């Protein structure tokens, strides 16, 4: 798996590959690893497939309850915190999950990394998964808070692509989302074989 996200002037870019594996067997090339928690919040998935899907779905349930009870959108901070507090009780039991919680709330663009080890941290850019090291190299060399929107799309797409190329456990398609002040949009889905054609 490779997933990344980054805050910038125009919100938050969120991208992922689409491969699933069972050991070395490629189980799928069409997995959706960005889950739509609500129309202003996304969660990304890396690690145990069932674990990510279940715990992010549960986070979505909880954020919706919150919103019903309190009559307002949950913050990115509070959402990420709910997830951290849920998984903390299970440390040591072998859950494997690495997520980015990506939104835009009253503090502006928001990006938290949360995982099954107990980490919860805010930051400007992250990459998560077996291919993260490869995505970081490319994302790091091109990142700027003042990227133009289309430049940011290009960067995210390229970083995941380059990760799929080196990492046996990443591949398929790159799925890209943009969190803007009035909601996220789905920006593209590009098969890595079509991106290869293009980038040479």
């Amino acid at each position: 798996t490779t997933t990344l996200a980054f805050k910038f002037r125009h919100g938050v870019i969120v991208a992922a590959d689409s491969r699933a594996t069972a050991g070395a067997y490629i189980a799928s090339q069409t997995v959706k690893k960005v889950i739509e928690i609500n129309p202003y919040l996304l969660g990304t998935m890396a690690g145990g497939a069932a674990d990510c899907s279940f715990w992010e779905r549960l986070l979505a349930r909880q954020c919706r309850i919150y919103e019903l009870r309190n009559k307002e959108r949950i913050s990115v901070a509070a959402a990420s915190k709910l997830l951290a507090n849920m998984v903390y009780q299970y440390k040591g039991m072998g859950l494997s999950m690495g997520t980015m919680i990506c939104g835009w709330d009253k503090r502006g663009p928001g990006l938290y990394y949360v995982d099954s080890e107990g980490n919860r941290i805010s930051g400007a850019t992250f990459s998560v998964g077996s291919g993260s090291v490869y995505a970081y190299g490319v994302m790091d060399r091109g990142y700027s808070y003042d990227l133009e929107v289309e430049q940011a799309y290009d960067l995210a797409r390229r970083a995941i692509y380059q990760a799929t190329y080196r990492d046996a456990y990443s591949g398929g398609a790159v799925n890209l989302y943009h969190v803007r002040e009035d909601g996220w949009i789905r920006v593209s889905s590009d098969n890595v074989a079509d991106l290869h054609e293009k980038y040479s």
Binding site: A20, A22, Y25, A27, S28, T30, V31, K32, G48, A49, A50, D51, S53, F54, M93, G94
Partner: protein, 213 residues
């Protein structure tokens, strides 16, 4: 150390068409180097519109299918309608995850009709990760079947071919071919192939002979 699991073999397969779904499985039940029985299908009717294929540890296949049966009735009693193919799939995901720390050793594939009358396949891992697919192989020979389905149904790695809709007749011919190919190489797949075809008219059944060795 008592082991609570054993591998009993079995291959499952599902294909979504425009107005049909196929769920297919071999009928061999194995243990070690032995055959328990040659007449043990891995397909289970859930509703008029939904069939599930289950393989892996037979003890868990039996238990899980009985749980699913009970839950379908419980749903119908509280909600006054049969569960849809998609709601069965979402539910199964949660039943599998409830055993996250002592899993059901079962590979599940659901085939059925969605709410628009179209073919639907959902495929699962043992702890309930799942998605919708156009087609999927599972169980003992899944690595043998899946690449061929990728190529012949997905049209992968082929240039200059019209991506036509999959006819029932072609999908049937594919299912029989891949199981026959699998019976040649997987020691666990054999005896007979059971095919369920789900359409608006209902669920019908064909059976084809496979090698007995």
């Amino acid at each position: 150390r008592f082991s609570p699991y054993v591998f009993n073999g079995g291959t499952i397969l599902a294909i979504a068409g425009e107005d049909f779904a196929i769920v297919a499985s071999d009928t061999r039940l194995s243990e070690g180097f032995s055959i328990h029985t040659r007449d043990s299908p891995k397909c289970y009717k859930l509703t008029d519109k939904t069939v599930i294929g289950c393989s892996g540890f037979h003890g868990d296949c039996l238990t899980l299918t009985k749980i699913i049966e009970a839950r379908l009735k419980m749903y119908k009693h509280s909600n006054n309608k049969a569960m849809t193919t998609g709601a069965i799939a979402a539910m199964l995901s949660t039943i599998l995850y409830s055993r996250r720390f002592f899993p059901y050793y079962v590979y599940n594939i659901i085939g059925g009709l969605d709410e628009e009358g179209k073919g639907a396949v959902y495929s699962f891992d043992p702890v309930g990760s799942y998605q919708r697919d156009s087609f999927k192989a599972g169980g003992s020979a899944s690595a043998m079947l899946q690449p061929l389905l990728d190529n012949q149904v997905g049209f992968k790695n082929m240039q200059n071919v019209e991506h036509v809709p999959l006819s029932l007749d072609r999908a049937m011919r594919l299912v029989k071919d891949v199981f026959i190919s699998a019976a040649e190489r997987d020691v666990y797949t054999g005896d007979a192939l059971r095919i369920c075809i789900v359409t608006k008219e209902g669920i019908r059944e064909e059976t084809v002979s496979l090698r007995k060795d």
